[PDB]
Amino acid sequence: MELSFGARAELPRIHPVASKLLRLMQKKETNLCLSADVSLARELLQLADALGPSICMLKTHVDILNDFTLDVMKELITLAKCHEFLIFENRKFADIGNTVKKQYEGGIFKIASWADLVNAHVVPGSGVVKGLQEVGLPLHRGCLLIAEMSSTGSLATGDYTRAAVRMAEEHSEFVVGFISGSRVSMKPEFLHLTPGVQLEAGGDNLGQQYNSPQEVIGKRGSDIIIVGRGIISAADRLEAAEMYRKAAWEAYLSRLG
Amino acid sequence: MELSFGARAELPRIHPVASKLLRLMQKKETNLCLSADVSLARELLQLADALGPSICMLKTHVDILNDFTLDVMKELITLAKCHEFLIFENRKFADIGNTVKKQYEGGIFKIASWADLVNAHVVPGSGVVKGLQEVGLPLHRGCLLIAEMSSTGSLATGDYTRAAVRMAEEHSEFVVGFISGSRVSMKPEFLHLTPGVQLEAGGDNLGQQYNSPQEVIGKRGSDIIIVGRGIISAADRLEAAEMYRKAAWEAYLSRLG
Ligand SMILES: O=c1cc(CO)n([C@@H]2O[C@H](COP(=O)(O)O)[C@@H](O)[C@H]2O)c(=O)[nH]1
Ligand SMILES: O=c1cc(CO)n([C@@H]2O[C@H](COP(=O)(O)O)[C@@H](O)[C@H]2O)c(=O)[nH]1
C-alpha cells in the first residue's frame, strides 16, 4: 500500500529531483515548504538560513524581490545546500512552448540556472511542458503542474484537473508532481504540494482560502504543505515553521499508520 | 449593428484605456499588435521606432530581455507617445489576488509603472482580477483576460471561456477585453486580441497554430491581431508589419461593410 517518503525516493520511475527531495524529507522529518513571499533579499536569506533546517523546500517569487540579483540566488543556493532543501520558483509558466522556454532560461532572472523546481499551468496544452523540458531536462530540473488551486472561483476542477494529471503522467521525465489541494495522481512517484494552508480557519480578502495541515495531508492525502503568511507574518518565524512542520509531519505519519 | 473602432471609442461604458486605443487604431488605420519577442533592448527599441507608425500596440515579454532596465522602458514609453501605440506586457498573471498585486506593482520590473495593459489567466477565479485592480485602477491601467489560447491542447474552451467572459463583464472598471481566437463577448466595449497569426498556414514545433488575419478578424470577428515571428523573423520587419497591418485592417473594413 502506501510507502514512506524514503521508499518512494527509490521507486523505479522516480525522477532524480523527486528522489533528492523525498530523501531529505525523510532525513529531516519535514514535509513543509516555506513560501518566502518577501520583498527584501536580506529577509529572504535570513529566513532561508534560520528556517532551512525545518523545511524540505523554499518557494520563491523572484519577481517580487525588490533587490534581486543572481548573487542573491547564489547565496540562497549556498543555504539550500547547507541546510538541505530544494529551491522552487513559483513562476507559473502559462503560455505556448516557444515562449516559456525563453522565460525559463533567459532574461534577467535566469530561473533555470538556480531553481530545482518550477511550475506551470496546464491551460495552454502540453506544449507548455515540452517547451520547458527543452531547457530543464539538460539542466536536470523538475516541474510541477498546477492541477487545482486554493482560491475562490478556481476553474482548475473536474476535466481540467484530469487533464493536468494526464499531462504529468505523460511527461514523467520532467514533471515530478503537482500543485493541488489533494492527492490527484494515484502514482506514488509524483509529489503533491498544497498551498492555502494555515492552522486556524480563515482566508484573505482576495480569494485565498485556508485549510489545516491535518486536513490537507491527513484527509486529502497530499505530501507537502506550502505555507506563506502563516509563518511569514508571525513574530517568531522559526517557531511558526516548527509548528507547521510538526503538524504536517504527524499528519503524514498517521496516514501512513 | 457593428460600430467602427472610432465609434466604439465613444461608447458610454468604454474604459479610458480602451478608448485611447480605439481612437488611435482609427486614426492610424492599424489593428496590428507587434509581439516584440526579442532579447536585446536595442532591437526592441529599434523595432518600436521603425514599426511604431504601423501598430496600435507593442506587446512585451520583459522577462526575456537580457538587458532590461527601467530606463529601457522609459525609452519605450517615449516611442509609444511619439508614434501613438499602447504598451502591453504579456505577463499572464495567474495566481491568487494577494500574490498578483505584488507581482504587478513591485519587484525589479515595476510592470504597473510602464504597462498600459497587462493580461491574466482566469483559472484562479476572480481574485486574480481583484488583486490586480488594487494596483491598476489607481494607475489608470487596463487588463485583458485570456479566454482562449492558440496552442494545441488548449483547455481554455467551453465553460472556461464562458467564465472568462463573465469575469471580464463583471469587472469592467479594469478589464477592457480578451486574449482570444474569436469574438467571445457580445458587448462592443470589450477588445478582442488574437495571437497565433501568420499569412501562411502552419504552426511551430511546440504547439503553436496559425491562422490568417482574414480568418481571425474577418470570419472569427476579432479586433486586433498579435503577430510575433511572422514579422520578427522576416528580413524587412517594416514591410512585414505593413503587410500584416493592411491584411488586418481590410478584414476589419470588409466585416464592417
Ligand atoms: O493555488 C495556489 C497556487 C499557488 C502557487 O503556489 N499559491 C501560492 O502559495 C502561496 C500561499 O501563501 P499564503 O500561505 O501566504 O496564503 C502564495 O505564494 C501563492 O502565490 C496559492 O496560494 N494557491
Ligand atoms: O494563446 C496565446 C496567448 C499568447 C499571449 O499573447 N500568445 C503569445 O503571442 C505571441 C505569438 O507569437 P508568434 O506570432 O511568434 O507565434 C507570443 O509572444 C505568445 O507568447 C500566443 O501565441 N497564444
Task: Give me the secondary-structure topology.
The structure is a homodimer of 257-residue chains.
Chain A: H1 5-8, H2 16-28, E1 32-35, H3 41-51, E2 57-60, H4 70-83, E3 86-93, H5 97-105, H6 111-114, E4 117-121, H7 127-136, E5 142-146, H8 158-169, E6 175-179, E7 191-194, H9 213-219, E8 224-227, H10 229-232, H11 237-256
Parallel strand pairs in A: 1-2, 1-8, 2-3, 3-4, 4-5, 5-6, 6-7, 7-8
Helix pairs in contact in A: 3-4, 5-7, 9-11
The structure holds 6-(hydroxymethyl)uridine 5'-(dihydrogen phosphate) (JW5) (2 copies).
One 6-(hydroxymethyl)uridine 5'-(dihydrogen phosphate) sits between chains A (35, 37, 90, 149-151, 179, 195-196, 208, 226-230) and B (95-96, 99).
GO biological process, one term (chains A, B): 'de novo' pyrimidine nucleobase biosynthetic process
Pathway (chains A, B): Pyrimidine metabolism; UMP biosynthesis via de novo pathway; UMP from orotate: step 1/2; Pyrimidine metabolism; UMP biosynthesis via de novo pathway; UMP from orotate: step 2/2
Binding site for UMP (chains A, B): 35, 37, 59-61, 95, 99, 150, 208-210, 228-229
